[PDB]
Design a protein around this motif. Structure first.
Motif, short mmCIF file in Angstrom:
data_model
loop_
_atom_site.label_atom_id
_atom_site.label_comp_id
_atom_site.label_asym_id
_atom_site.label_seq_id
_atom_site.Cartn_x
_atom_site.Cartn_y
_atom_site.Cartn_z
N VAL A 197 0.82 -0.96 0.06
CA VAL A 197 0.16 0.01 0.00
C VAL A 197 0.81 1.14 0.05
N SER A 198 1.95 1.08 1.03
CA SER A 198 2.90 2.34 0.84
C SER A 198 3.56 2.50 -0.40
N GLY A 199 3.80 1.28 -1.07
CA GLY A 199 4.84 1.28 -2.36
C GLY A 199 3.95 1.88 -3.18
N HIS A 200 2.92 1.94 -3.43
CA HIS A 200 2.00 2.42 -4.27
C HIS A 200 1.21 3.72 -3.89
N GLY A 201 2.06 4.29 -3.00
CA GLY A 201 1.67 5.76 -2.59
C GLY A 201 0.43 6.09 -1.96
N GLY A 202 -0.19 5.15 -1.01
CA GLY A 202 -1.37 5.32 -0.17
C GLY A 202 -2.27 4.16 -0.71
N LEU A 203 -3.62 4.34 0.02
CA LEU A 203 -4.50 3.55 -0.56
C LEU A 203 -5.10 4.05 -1.82
N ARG A 204 -5.18 4.93 -2.32
CA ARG A 204 -5.75 5.35 -3.38
C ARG A 204 -4.91 4.72 -4.63
N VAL A 226 -4.07 0.67 -8.82
CA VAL A 226 -3.47 -0.31 -9.53
C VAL A 226 -4.16 -1.75 -9.40
N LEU A 227 -4.64 -1.99 -8.26
CA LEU A 227 -5.72 -3.40 -8.15
C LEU A 227 -6.75 -3.15 -9.33
N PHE A 228 -7.35 -2.03 -9.52
CA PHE A 228 -8.54 -2.26 -10.19
C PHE A 228 -8.14 -1.96 -11.68
N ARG A 229 -7.05 -1.29 -12.03
CA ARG A 229 -6.59 -1.38 -13.38
C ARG A 229 -5.85 -2.77 -14.06
N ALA A 230 -4.71 -3.16 -13.15
CA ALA A 230 -4.18 -4.23 -13.26
C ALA A 230 -4.10 -5.35 -12.64
N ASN A 231 -5.28 -5.39 -11.87
CA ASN A 231 -5.59 -6.51 -10.94
C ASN A 231 -4.16 -7.16 -10.11
N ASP A 232 -3.34 -6.38 -10.05
CA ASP A 232 -1.96 -6.62 -9.32
C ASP A 232 -1.26 -5.53 -8.57
N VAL A 233 -0.95 -5.89 -7.44
CA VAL A 233 -0.54 -4.71 -6.30
C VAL A 233 1.08 -4.81 -6.01
#
Ligand code: CDL
Ligand code: PC1
Ligand code: 3PE
Ligand code: NDP
Ligand code: SF4
Ligand code: SF4
Ligand code: SF4
Ligand code: ZN
Lengths: 38, 94, 114, 290, 144, 94, 154, 378, 206, 176, 45
Positions: free
Chosen positions: E13-20, E25-32
Motif C-alpha cells: 500500500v505504501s509502495g503504491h503511494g497510499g490507499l488510493r 493499480v488493483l482495479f486497473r491491473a489486478n496486481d498490487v
C-alpha cells in the motif's frame, strides 16, 4: 476369364468432370518451343 | 511527395489514385486511404554525391553483411554520377 | 480387345444391374424426401433419378457400366444410411445456380466462353 | 461505362456484375434476399444501416471480400444519405415498418424518408432508382399504412421521374409477417413469393425498359382470406388495428400495370412453398378464385 | 513469518503511494506488486522489473491512462507498447531503451500507434498499380 | 521461491517430495536474454585448393537402379535374422 | 430516459464481456495453441472465459483450424444452435482465408463463407498470447455495443 | 441394436446393444486438405512446412522424416552437428507428444489436472522451438541438408535446466494415475490386441510394443546419430490400454535420458551440408561471392533438382512409424509424395479393438491410439 | 567424404540376392527386380500375382514380411496402365523392407489384399477414393477422405488443384451449397525447370 | 535394449496380502493422490498477468511482416521477386517497373496475411533484407479485408517497427 | 577470433534424473487396521 470389348475406350462418364469442361475445351498437344533466351 | 487529386484523394508513391468516376473509392468512406508519407524517390535524392579518388568504387549499402550484395561501379563517364543499382547512392570521381 | 471384367461379362448382364439399381433408387426417394425433410416432391426426386440415369444411356462398355453402377450404389448407401446431410442430397438440384445461357446470342452478350 | 464497372467473370461470387447498389432497409425481410442476390453475382453492395452492427452480421457472408460495405445513416439526415449513394449506379429503397413508433410514423417512413432518398439520389446523379410501394396503396384506404404508401409513391415519381416503382402484394417467405402472422394467431388475397419479388427487383436493375415504370408483383393465384388461413393451419398441423385492416383489404387487380412475367420471372405458387415457411410452426390445397 | 507476510502486504500500500494508488493499480491491473521503475515512455506507460519474480512476471508495464487522444484508464491494449520498449518487455533483450536506445532514423514514426482495427483509422486495402489498358476516346466533333 | 517455511513444509509433506530443489517456475538459473555475438565455424568444403566440386558432388554419384532381373544353390533371406534384444541392466523391471 | 439507457447498456455489456463462454472447434493445429491459452501461463479462465462449454451454453465460437468442405455443414449447424448473443472468432490462416490449403479442392477458403466472423486472429498458428489478444479485442467490441440506445431511438 | 451417430474432429457411427459396442465405423476426412496433391506443386523446400502440419504435435519429427527421404534421394548426408540437433529436438518433440497424448487421454476420461501441470512444461518446450526457429510449433527448422540455423548461444544451458527437473514432473503425473484404482479400471484389459493381430493390422510404435513385440526403428533401422545414444525400449505384457500408457510414460523418461546425452556429446561444426547446390550459403557469402549469389538465387526460385527415383523412408515418430513414399522425376518438384501416418492404420483398428467393450471404453481406446487427424486425413 | 552419403555394398548384395530368390520362386508373376543405389528392393509383378506374391512374402520362412507399412498408388498418364500400385512391406524377423509394384488402368480391377493384410482395408479405400482404382472383393469399398457425393478422384494428374466446385452458406436456402469454383486470385503456375540437364547418369536414349 | 513396464508378481504372503487389503478398504492410494493436488494448491501459480506481462520471445520470432529501408530512406526492395517465388502459400504478389529515376522498384507488393503461413522463407530468400517478419503479433482485425496488406501497409509497418526490427536483426544476423 | 558456438560446459553437464521415483510412505496394513479398529473401540466406549 477375359471378356471381349470392341468399343472405343471412353471414360467421360466416370471421371467426374462437368460437361462444359469436356465438350467446349480444346486440348493442345505439342512439344514446347525452346525458350529463346537460353 | 504526397499530393492530392482534385477529388481530394492522396496519390501514392506508385502514382495510384482513383479517378473521378471510380466507384471503388467508396471503400474509403468513413475510413481512410493507407498512404506511406516517406517517398523513397524523394529521400534518396537528398543524399549527397560521394567524391572518390578512383575510377572504380564498390558499394555494399553500408553495414557490411546487413547491406546489399557488393557491386563495383565504374566512374569513367564525366557527364554523370555512378549510381548503385541496389541502394541508389551516387558516386563521382575527382 | 480381351480385358478383365469388373462384374458383367457383356452388356446384357450389365443392363440387369442397371435396372436393379434404378429400382432401388426409385423406392428410396419417398424415404429420402421424408427423412431429410426435403421441400421437393417425390415426383421431383424421381425425375432427378431418371435424369441421372438417362445422361449415361449411351454407354456401350460393360466395364464402364459396371463402374457407374458401383458408384451409383455407393451414392445410394450414403443416402440410405444418412451419411449425407440435407445439403448433400440437395446438391443434385442446383437451386442457387442462376440459369446459364444456352443460345449463341446470350453467350455472346455475357462473355467470351463458348 | 467506366472501366471498373464492365462485367467480368461467369456471374459467380468472385465475378464482377457491374452493379453498384445502395440498398436502404437492407437489414429487414426483403433486404436480405436482395443483398444476397446482388452478392451472388459479384455486385458492389452499400448497406446503410440504422441498427447495431451485430444485427447486420448475417449479411457479411453474402459477398466476396470487399463487396459488402456498411455505413451509418439517419432517415432524417440527408448528408448521411449523400455519402451512401454518391458512388452508386442504382439505389434500392426497402425502408418500412408495419407499425408506428414514438420516433417514426408511417408518414416519416413511407413519405419523407423515401422522398429524401429519391431527392438526394437524383442530386448525386444516380441513374436507377427502385422504390417499393404496395399493391393496395390507396389514399382512400382505412389503413394509414396504405394511405402513406400512396402519398409516397406519388412523391417519389415526381422527385425521380425515372424511378422504377414496384407494388407487391403481401409477401410470403421464411421471415414474413404473413404466413407466420396467421400461424401465430369477403376478402381476396393474391400473395407473392419472397424469391419472386427479389428476382423481379434484380431484373428491374438489368432491364433498361423498367426505368420510369410501375410494376405490380402478385402471385399466380387468388384465394379467400378464409381459405388461406385454414390452409395455413392444415399445413402447420394445428398485431395492431392497422395490420388487421391491411389483411382485410382485398388485393387490387391492376391489369394496366406490368408484372413479374414482364420482367422474366415466373410466379411461384403458395402451395409449393407453404411447407418451407410453416414447417417450423408444425393437406387439401386452398381453392382458388378464377 | 505470518507477521512478516502481512507487513509486506502493508508495504505494498505504501509502495503504491497510499490507499488510493494501491486501489488504482488493483482495479486497473489486478496486481498490487511493487517493482523498480525501469523507465517511462513518451506516452506515459511505466515499466517495472522485479528479478525475485519468476521468469515471465519479472517485467511488466503499467499502461498510461491516455494515449493518442484515447481514454485508456480501463481500455488498455497490448499494442500500446511502443517498439523500443516492446523488445525489452518481451525479453528479446536484457537492455531497456533507457540504457541502449534504438538507432535514430528520419523515417521512423515519432509517434507510435496502437491497433486501429474497427475505427475510422483502420486500414482498407486497394490496388496500388495504375490502369493497364487505355481506352480510345472518340472525337468531340461530329463527322459521321 | 518465496513461500514461507511453513508452506514449504506443508507442500513438501503433502507431495512426499522435496519440491524446493526442482521448482517448476524459473528464476535466475536461466541464460541471459542478451548474449555475446557468435562466430560460427565453416564446413569442410571451405578451402582454397584441392576442393574441386566434382570430387564432392553427391547428387552426381547417384545412379539408376540396378536391374537384377527383367522379363525383357542355397536359400537366402533379405538380410540376416535379427539378433535377440538384451534386457536393460539399467532397470529391467519398472 | 437516456442516462438510464446508457447505464443499462454498460451493465449488460459488462456482464456479457466479463462472462464469455467459448465453444472451440478444435479442427487442427490452432487448437493446440488454444489449449495453451487455457494452460496455466495464460489461464483464460481468469478472465471469466470457461475452459469448455457446450454449444447450447456458448457465447463465442472459436474456429481453430482448417475448415474442409466435408466439415462445413456441421460447423454451420453448431453455429445455428448457439443462443444469442453469439460471436465468432476466426483463429489462424486456415480459418481466416484458407491459409496453406487455400487452393485445395477440399477446403473452404475462409470460415467467413459459412458464418459471420467478428474477430480474425492472424498466424499459422497464432501464439496463445495472440489468441488472448484477439479474445480481449472481442471483449472491447462487446463493450462498444449500444443495443438499448438504438432500441429506444427506434 | 441402437445406432449412434457420434486431435481434430471425428464422426463415429456406432451400433450398441445395451452397454456394448457391436460395431465402430469411423467416418474421417473432416480434416482432409489434399496435402499430398498440393506438394506436387511445390519445390522440395516449399513442401517442407506441410510436414509440420500433419501430426501437428510432433512437428520436427515429421520434418526429420521428410528431410531424411530427400537426403537419401539427393545422395548427400547432413553434417554431424545437425544430426545431433535433430536427435536432440526429436526427443524434445517426443516429450511434447507424450505429454499431449497422456494428459489429454487422461482429460477425456475426467482426470483433468495433470493436463494443466504438464502443459506448463510444454510451454517451456515451445520456447526452445521458438528460440531456434522463431516459431513455437511450425518451426520448419529441420530441412534436407541439416537444420536452418545454429543453436543460439545459451540455449543448451536452458535445455539442461529444463531436463534436470522434468522427471519429477513425470513422477507427479504417475502419482495421479499409475496406481489410481479408478485410472486402472478405465485402462486395464481395455482394447487388448494380440501381437499377431497388431502386425497384420499395420500397427507400429507403442501399438506394437504394448503387446510385447520388441521393435523400435531407432534401434533396428537407426537414422541420424541414434546408434550413438543409450536408451531402453519399454515393452508391455498385456497389450491393453494400461500397458500402453505405462510404455508412453517410460518413453518420456528415456527421452530425458537421450536428451542428457545429446547435450553432453554435442559436437562443433557446421549445421547444414557444405554443398551450396543443396543447402543455401550463408548470407554474408551470398552478399560477397558470385557463386554464392547465383546458388542462393537458384535454390530459392527453382530449388535443387533431385535425381529421379523413389524411396520409402520411415522414422520412429512419437505416434509410431511415420514415413513418406517420395517419388522424384528428376526435377525440382516431387512427382508424388505419399505420407504414411501411423494413426491411419491405428484408427482403422478401432472397430476390432472396441469389440466386447462399452461406449465409454471407446473413449479410452481412441486415446490409447494417440490419434491426430492432421496425419490421418492429410 | 563428409557431404556424400556413403554406400552400403553389403545391403546392396543381400537385397540383390533376395530379389533373384523371389524371382526364381514366382516366375509366373515377376516381371522386373531392381535395387536402388540407396538399397531399396523393388519387385514388379503382373497384377494377377498380387495375392500369391504378397502371401508368399508374408508367410514364407525366408521372407516373413508380416507388416504392411503402406499401400498407395501413383498416376502416370503417359502409360497405357496409368496407375502404379505400390506395396511397402516390412519384415521384423529379417529387419528388412521390400516394395512390390503392379499396375492397372481406369477399368481393370485389382484384387483386394485384405485377406493377406488387414491393414490394407483403408489403404485400398483411399486409393479408390483418390485414384478410382477398384479393388475386387473388398469388404466395404467406398470413399474415405473426400466429401459425400464428391465427383472425381482428386489425386489423378488431370484433376485440377482447386477442383470444380466450392462451398458457401446461402441464406436464401438456409444451407451450405456447392457452386462452380471461382478464385479471387488464380493459382500462379510457375515454370521452374532449367533447360540444362542436371543428371547425365539418367539420360534417356534418343 | 528393453525393459518390462508391467511384469511383476505380487507377493502372496499374509503381510503383503493384508497391505493390499488395507489399500483396497482404506483407499490409501486415493488419499496419496489427494496429497499431490493439495501440494499444488500451495504452489505459486505459473500464470502471467497479460497484457501487463508478456511471454518471452527471442530475436528470431516470426511475426507481422514489414518492408524495410536503407538508412537514407531508400527502399531496400529491388523487386527481384525471390520472396514471391519461394513463398509456400503464394501469399505474395508483386509488380514492378522502372521508377521515374530509373530505379528497379515495385509498384505492387501485396501479402495476403490469411494465405501466409508465417514460415519466414521470404525473409531468408530476400538478398537485401527488405522483407522481414517483425516482432509484432498483436494485430488481429474485425474484418477479413484488413488482413490483405498492400505495399503502403507494409512500408508503414517498416517505419513503425524499424527500431525493434533493426535491433533484432543485429542480434541474430551472425547466425544467418 | 576463435569460433564461438553453443557448446556444453567443459566436463559436461551434471547428472540428470530420469528413473521413476515414487517413494514408499505410510504404515503396514496391519498397523492401519490396528489404528482403525482402535478408533472404533474408543468411539464405542
Ligand atoms: C486458511 C486460512 C489461513 C489464513 C492465513 C492467511 C495467510 O497468512 O497466508 C499467507 C501466508 C503466506 O503464505 P505463502 O504461500 O508462503 O505466500 C507466499 C509469499 O510468502 C507471500 O508473500 P508476498 O510478498 O506475496 O505478500 C504480499 C501479499 C501479502 O500477503 C498476505 O498478507 C496474505 C494475507 C492473507 C490474510 C488472510 C487471513 C485469513 C482471514 C480469514 C478469512 C477467510 C476465511 C473465512 O500482499 C497481498 O497480495 C495482499 C492482498 C490481499 C489478499 C486478500 C486476502 C484477504 C483474505 C480474507 C478475505 C476477507 C474479505 O501463509 C503463511 O505464512 C503460512 C501460515 C498461514 C496459515 C496456513 C494454513 C494453511 C491451511 C491449513 C491446511 C488446510 C488445507 C485444506
Ligand atoms: C447487481 C448489480 C451488480 C453491479 C455490477 C457492477 C459492475 C462493476 C464494473 O463495471 O466493473 C468495473 C469496470 C472496470 O472496467 P473494465 O471492465 O473495462 O476493466 C478494465 C481493467 N482490465 C483491463 C483489467 C480489464 O467498469 C467498467 O468497465 C464500466 C462498466 C460499468 C457497469 C456498471 C453499470 C451500473
Ligand atoms: C470391533 C468390531 C468392529 C466391526 C466393524 C469393523 C469394520 C471396520 C473395518 C472395515 C472398514 C470398511 C471400509 C469402508 C469403506 C468402503 C470400502 C470400499 O468399499 O472400498 C472398495 C471400493 C472398491 O474397491 P476396488 O479396488 O475398486 O475393487 C474391490 C471390489 N472388487 O473402493 C472405493 O470405494 C473407492 C472410493 C471411490 C471414491 C473416490 C473419491 C474420493 C476418495 C477420497 C475420499 C477421502 C475419504 C473421505 C472421508 C469422508 C469423511 C466424511
Ligand atoms: N413484407 C411485405 O409483406 C411487404 C413489404 N413491402 C415493402 O417492402 C419494404 C421492405 O419490406 P420488409 O423487408 O418486410 O420491411 P422490414 O420491416 O422487414 O425491414 C424494413 C427495413 O427498414 C428499415 N427501417 C425501418 N424504419 C426505419 C427508419 N425509421 N430509419 C431507417 N431505417 C428504417 C429497417 O431497418 P432496422 O432493421 O434498423 O429497423 C429494415 O431494414 C418496405 O418498404 C415494405 O413496405 C410491400 C409490400 C408487402
Ligand atoms: S492456420 Fe496454421 S497452425 Fe492453424 S490449423 Fe492452419 S496450418 Fe495449422
Ligand atoms: S512467411 Fe512464408 S507464407 Fe508468409 S509471406 Fe513469407 S514466405 Fe510466404
Ligand atoms: S522483398 Fe526482397 S526478395 Fe522480395 S522482391 Fe523485394 S528484394 Fe526481392
Ligand atoms: Zn549500394
Amino acid at each position: 476369364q477375359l471378356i471381349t470389348v470392341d468399343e472405343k475406350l471412353d471414360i467421360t462418364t466416370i471421371t467426374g468432370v462437368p460437361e462444359e469442361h469436356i465438350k467446349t475445351r480444346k486440348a493442345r498437344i505439342f512439344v514446347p518451343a525452346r525458350n529463346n533466351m537460353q | 511527395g504526397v499530393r492530392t487529386s482534385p477529388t481530394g484523394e492522396k496519390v501514392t508513391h506508385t502514382g495510384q489514385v482513383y479517378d473521378d468516376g471510380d466507384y471503388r473509392k467508396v471503400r474509403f468512406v468513413g475510413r481512410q486511404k493507407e498512404v506511406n508519407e516517406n517517398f523513397a524517390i524523394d529521400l534518396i535524392a537528398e543524399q549527397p554525391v560521394s567524391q572518390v579518388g578512383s575510377r572504380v568504387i564498390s558499394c555494399d549499402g553500408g553495414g557490411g553483411a546487413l547491406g546489399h550484395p557488393r557491386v563495383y561501379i565504374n566512374l569513367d563517364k564525366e557527364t554523370k554520377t555512378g549510381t548503385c543499382g541496389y541502394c541508389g547512392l551516387q558516386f563521382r570521381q575527382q | 480387345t480381351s480385358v478383365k471384367p469388373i462384374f458383367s461379362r457383356d452388356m446384357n448382364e450389365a443392363k440387369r444391374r442397371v435396372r436393379e439399381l434404378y429400382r432401388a433408387w426409385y423406392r428410396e426417394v419417398p424415404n429420402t424426401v421424408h427423412l431429410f425433410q426435403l421441400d421437393i416432391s417425390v415426383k421431383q426426386g424421381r425425375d432427378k433419378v431418371r435424369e441421372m440415369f438417362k445422361k449415361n444411356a449411351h454407354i456401350t462398355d460393360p466395364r464402364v457400366v459396371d463402374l457407374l453402377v458401383i458408384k451409383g450404389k455407393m451414392e445410394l448407401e450414403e443416402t440410405i444410411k444418412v451419411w449425407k446431410q440435407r445439403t448433400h442430397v440437395m446438391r443434385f438440384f442446383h437451386e442457387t445456380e442462376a440459369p446459364r445461357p444456352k443460345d449463341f446470342l446470350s453467350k455472346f452478350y455475357v462473355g467470351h466462353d463458348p | 461505362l467506366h472501366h471498373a464497372v464492365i462485367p467480368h467473370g461467369k456471374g459467380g461470387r468472385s465475378s464482377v456484375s457491374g452493379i453498384v447498389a445502395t440498398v436502404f432497409g437492407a437489414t429487414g425481410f426483403l433486404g436480405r434476399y436482395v443483398v444476397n442476390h446482388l452478392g451472388r453475382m459479384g455486385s458492389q453492395v452499400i448497406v446503410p444501416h440504422r441498427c447495431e452492427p451485430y444485427d447486420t452480421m448475417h449479411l457479411r457472408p453474402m459477398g466476396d471480400l470487399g463487396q459488402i460495405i456498411f455505413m451509418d445513416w439517419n432517415g432524417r439526415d440527408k448528408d448521411s444519405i449523400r455519402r451512401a449513394v454518391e458512388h452508386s449506379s442504382v439505389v434500392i429503397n426497402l425502408v418500412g415498418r408495419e407499425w408506428e413508433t414514438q420516433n417514426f410514423d408511417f408518414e416519416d417512413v413511407f413519405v419523407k424518408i423515401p422522398q429524401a432518398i429519391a431527392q438526394v439520389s437524383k442530386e448525386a446523379g444516380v441513374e436507377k432508382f427502385i422504390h417499393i410501394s404496395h399493391l393496395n396503396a390507396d389514399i382512400k384506404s382505412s389503413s394509414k399504412y396504405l394511405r402513406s404508401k400512396a402519398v409516397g409513391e406519388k412523391e417519389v415519381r415526381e422527385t425521380f421521374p425515372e424511378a422504377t416503382i414496384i407494388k407487391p402484394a403481401e409477401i410470403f417467405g421464411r421471415e414474413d409477417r404473413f404466413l407466420n402472422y396467421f400461424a401465430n394467431i369477403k376478402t381476396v388475397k393474391q400473395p407473392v413469393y419472397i424469391v419472386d419479388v427479389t428476382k423481379g427487383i434484380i431484373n428491374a436493375i438489368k432491364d433498361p425498359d423498367a426505368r420510369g415504370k410501375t410494376f405490380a408483383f402478385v402471385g399466380p393465384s387468388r384465394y379467400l382470406l378464409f381459405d388461406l388461413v385454414q390452409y395455413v393451419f392444415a399445413v402447420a398441423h394445428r398485431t395492431t388495428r392497422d395490420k388487421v385492416e391491411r389483411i382485410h383489404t382485398t388485393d387490387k387487380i391492376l391489369p394496366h400495370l406490368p408484372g413479374l412475367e414482364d420482367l422474366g420471372v415466373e410466379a411461384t405458387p403458395l402451395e409449393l412453398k407453404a411447407i418451407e415457411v410453416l414447417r417450423r410452426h408444425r393437406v387439401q390445397p386452398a381453392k382458388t378464385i378464377p | 513469518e505470518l507477521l512478516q507476510v502481512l507487513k509486506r502486504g502493508l508495504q505494498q500500500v505504501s509502495g503504491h503511494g497510499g490507499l488510493r494508488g494501491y486501489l488504482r493499480v488493483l482495479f486497473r491491473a489486478n496486481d498490487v506488486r511493487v517493482g523498480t521503475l525501469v523507465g517511462e515512455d513518451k506516452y506515459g506507460n511505466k515499466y517495472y522489473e522485479d528479478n525475485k519474480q519468476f521468469f515471465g512476471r519479472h517485467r511488466w508495464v503499467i499502461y498510461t491512462t491516455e494515449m493518442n487522444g484515447k481514454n485508456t484508464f480501463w481500455d488498455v491494449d497490448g499494442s500500446m507498447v511502443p517498439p523500443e520498449w516492446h523488445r525489452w518487455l518481451h525479453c528479446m533483450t536484457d537492455d531497456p531503451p533507457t540504457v541502449k536506445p534504438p538507432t535514430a532514423r528520419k523515417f521512423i514514426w515519432t509517434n507510435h500507434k496502437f491497433n486501429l482495427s474497427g475505427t475510422p483509422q483502420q486500414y482498407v486495402p486497394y490496388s496500388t498499380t495504375r490502369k493497364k489498358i487505355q481506352e480510345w476516346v472518340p472525337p468531340s466533333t461530329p463527322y459521321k | 521461491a518465496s513461500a514461507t517455511r511453513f508452506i514449504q513444509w506443508l507442500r513438501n509433506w503433502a507431495s512426499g517430495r522435496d519440491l524446493q530443489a526442482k521448482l517448476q517456475l524459473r528464476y535466475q538459473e536461466i541464460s541471459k536474454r542478451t548474449q555475446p555475438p557468435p562466430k560460427l565455424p565453416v564446413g569442410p568444403s571451405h578451402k582454397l585448393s584441392n576442393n574441386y566440386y566434382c570430387t564432392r558432388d553427391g547428387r552426381r554419384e547417384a545412379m539408376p537402379p540396378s536391374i537384377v532381373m527383367s522379363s525383357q544353390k542355397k536359400a537366402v533371406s533379405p538380410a540376416p535374422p535379427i539378433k535377440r534384444w538384451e534386457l536393460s541392466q539399467d532397470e529391467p523391471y519398472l | 430516459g437516456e442516462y438510464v439507457v446508457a447505464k443499462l447498456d454498460d451493465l449488460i455489456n459488462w456482464a456479457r464481456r466479463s462472462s464469455l463462454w467459448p465453444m472451440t472447434f478444435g479442427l487442427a493445429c490452432c487448437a493446440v495453441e488454444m489449449m495453451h491459452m487455457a494452460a496455466p501461463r495464460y489461464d483464460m479462465d481468469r478472465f471469466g472465459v470457461v475452459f469448455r462449454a457446450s454449444p447450447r451454453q456458448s457465447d463465442v465460437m472459436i474456429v481453430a483450424g482448417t475448415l474442409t468442405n466435408k466439415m462445413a455443414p456441421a460447423l454451420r449447424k453448431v453455429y445455428d444452435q448457439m443462443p444469442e448473443p453469439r460471436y465468432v472468432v476466426s483463429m489462424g490462416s486456415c480459418a481466416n482465408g484458407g491459409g496453406y490449403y487455400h487452393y485445395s479442392y477440399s477446403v473452404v477458403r475462409g470460415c467467413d463463407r459459412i458464418v459471420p466472423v467478428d474477430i480474425y486472429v492472424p498466424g499459422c498458428p497464432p501464439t496463445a498470447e495472440a489468441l488472448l489478444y484477439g479474445i480481449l479485442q472481442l471483449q472491447k467490441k462487446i463493450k462498444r455495443e449500444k443495443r438499448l440506445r438504438i432500441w429506444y431511438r427506434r | 441394436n441402437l445406432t449412434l451417430n457420434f486431435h481434430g474432429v471425428l464422426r463415429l457411427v456406432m451400433e450398441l446393444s445395451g452397454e456394448m459396442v457391436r460395431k465402430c465405423d469411423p467416418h474421417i476426412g473432416l480434416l482432409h486438405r489434399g496435402t499430398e496433391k498440393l506438394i506436387e506443386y511445390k519445390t522440395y523446400l516449399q513442401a517442407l512446412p506441410y510436414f509440420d502440419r500433419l501430426d501437428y504435435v510432433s512437428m520436427m519429427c515429421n520434418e526429420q522424416a521428410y528431410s531424411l527421404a530427400v537426403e537419401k534421394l539427393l545422395n548427400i548426408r547432413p553434417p554431424p552437428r545437425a544430426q545431433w540437433i535433430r536427435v536432440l529436438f526429436g526427443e524434445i518433440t517426443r516429450l511434447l507428444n507424450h505429454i499431449m497424448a497422456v494428459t489429454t487421454h487422461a482429460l477425456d476420461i475426467g482426470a483433468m489436472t495433470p493436463f494443466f501441470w504438464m502443459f506448463e512444461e510444454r510451454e517451456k518446450m515451445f520456447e526452445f522451438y521458438e528460440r531456434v526457429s522463431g516459431a513455437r510449433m511450425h518451426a520448419a527448422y529441420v530441412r534436407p541438408g541439416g537444420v536452418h540455423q545454429d543453436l543460439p548461444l545459451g540455449l543448451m544451458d536452458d535445455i539442461y535446466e529444463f531436463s534436470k527437473n522434468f522427471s519429477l514432473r513425470i513422477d507427479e503425473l504417475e502419482e495421479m494415475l499409475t496406481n489410481n484404482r479408478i485410472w486402472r479400471n478405465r485402462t486395464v484389459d481395455i482394447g487388448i490386441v494380440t501381437a499377431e493381430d497388431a502386425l497384420n493390422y499395420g500397427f507400429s510404435g507403442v501399438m506394437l510394443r504394448g503387446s510385447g513385440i520388441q521393435w523400435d526403428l531407432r534401434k533396428t533401422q537407426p537414422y541420424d546419430v541414434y546408434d550413438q545414444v543409450e536408451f531402453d525400449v519399454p515393452i508391455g505384457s498385456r497389450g491393453d490400454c494400461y500397458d500402453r500408457y505405462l510404455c508412453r510414460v517410460e518413453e518420456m523418461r528415456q527421452s530425458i535420458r537421450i536428451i542428457s546425452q545429446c547435450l553432453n556429446k554435442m559436437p562443433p561444426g557446421e549445421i547444414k551440408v557444405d554443398d551450396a547446390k543443396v543447402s543455401p550459403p550463408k548470407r554474408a557469402e551470398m552478399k560477397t561471392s558470385m557463386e554464392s549469389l547465383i546458388h542462393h538465387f537458384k535454390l530459392y526460385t527453382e530449388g535443387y533438382q533431385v535425381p529421379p527415383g523413389a524411396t520409402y523412408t520411415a522414422i520412429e515418430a512419437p505416434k509410431g512409424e511415420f514415413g513418406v513414399y517420395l517419388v522424384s522425376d528428376g526435377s525440382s518438384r516431387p512427382y508424388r509424395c505419399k505420407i504414411k501416418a501411423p494413426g491411419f492404420a491405428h484408427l482403422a483398428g478401432l472397430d476390432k479393438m472396441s469389440k466386447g467393450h462399452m461406449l465409454a471404453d471407446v473413449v479410452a481406446i481412441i486415446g490409447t491410439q494417440d490419434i491426430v487427424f492432421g496425419e490421418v486425413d492429410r | 567424404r563428409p557431404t556424400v552419403r556413403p554406400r552400403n555394398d553389403v545391403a546392396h548384395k543381400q537385397l540383390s540376392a533376395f530379389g533373384e530368390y523371389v524371382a526364381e520362386i514366382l516366375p509366373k508373376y515377376v516381371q522386373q527386380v531392381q535395387v536402388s543405389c540407396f538399397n531399396e528392393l523393388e519387385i514388379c509383378i503382373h497384377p494377377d500375382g498380387v495375392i500369391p506374391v504378397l502371401t508368399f512374402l508374408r508367410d514364407h520362412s525366408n521372407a516373413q514380411f508380416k507388416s504392411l507399412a503402406d499401400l498407395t498408388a501413383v498416376d502416370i498418364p503417359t502409360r497405357q496402365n496409368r496407375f502404379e500400385i505400390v506395396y511397402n512391406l516390412l519384415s521384423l524377423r529379417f529387419n528388412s523392407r521390400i516394395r512390390v509394384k503392379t499396375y492397372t488402368d481406369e477399368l481393370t480391377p485389382i484384387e483386394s489384399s485384405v485377406p493377406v493384410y488387414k491393414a490394407a482395408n483403408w489403404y485400398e479405400r483411399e486409393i479408390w477414393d483418390m485414384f478410382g482404382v477398384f479393388f475386387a472383393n473388398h469388404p466395404d469399398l467406398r470413399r474415405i477422405l473426400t466429401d459425400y457425393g464428391f465427383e472425381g478422384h482428386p489425386f489423378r494428374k488431370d484433376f485440377p488443384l482447386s477442383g470444380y466446385v466450392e462451398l458457401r452458406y446461402d441464406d436464401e436456402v438456409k444451407r451450405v451449397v456447392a457452386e462452380p469454383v471461382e478464385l479471387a486470385q488464380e493459382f500462379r503456375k510457375f515454370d521452374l525447370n532449367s533447360p540444362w540437364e542436371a543428371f547425365p547418369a539418367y539420360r534417356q536414349p534418343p | 535394449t528393453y525393459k518390462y513396464v508391467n511384469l511383476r508378481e505380487p507377493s502372496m504372503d499374509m503381510k503383503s496380502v493384508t497391505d493390499r487389503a488395507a489399500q483396497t478398504l482404506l483407499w490409501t492410494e486415493l488419499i496419496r493422490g489427494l496429497g499431490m493436488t493439495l501440494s499444488y494448491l500451495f504452489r505459486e501459480p505459473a500464470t502471467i498477468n497479460y497484457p501487463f506481462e508478456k511471454g518471452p520471445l527471442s530475436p528470431r520470432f516470426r511475426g507481422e511482416h514489414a518492408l524495410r529501408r536503407y538508412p537514407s530512406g531508400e527502399e531496400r526492395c529491388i523487386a527481384c521477386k525471390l520472396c514471391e517465388a519461394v513463398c509456400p502459400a503464394q501469399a505474395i504478389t508483386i509488380e514492378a517497373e522502372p521508377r521515374a529515376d530509373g530505379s528497379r522498384r515495385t509498384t505492387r507488393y501485396d501479402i495476403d496475411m490469411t494465405k501466409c503461413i508465417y514460415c519466414g522463407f521470404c525473409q531468408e530468400a530476400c538478398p537485401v533484407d527488405a522483407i522481414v517478419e517483425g516482432p509484432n503479433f498483436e494485430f488481429s482485425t474485425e474484418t477479413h479485408e484488413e488482413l490483405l496488406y498492400n505495399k503502403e501497409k507494409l512500408l508503414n509497418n517498416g517505419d513503425k517497427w524499424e527500431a525493434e526490427i533493426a535491433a533484432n536483426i543485429q542480434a541474430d544476423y551472425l547466425y544467418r | 577470433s576463435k569460433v564461438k558456438q553453443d557448446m556444453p560446459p567443459v566436463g559436461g553437464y551434471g547428472p540428470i534424473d530420469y528413473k521413476r521415483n515414487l517413494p514408499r510412505r505410510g504404515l503396514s496394513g496391519y498397523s492401519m487396521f490396528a489404528v482403525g479398529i482402535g478408533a472404533l473401540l474408543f468411539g464405542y466406549w
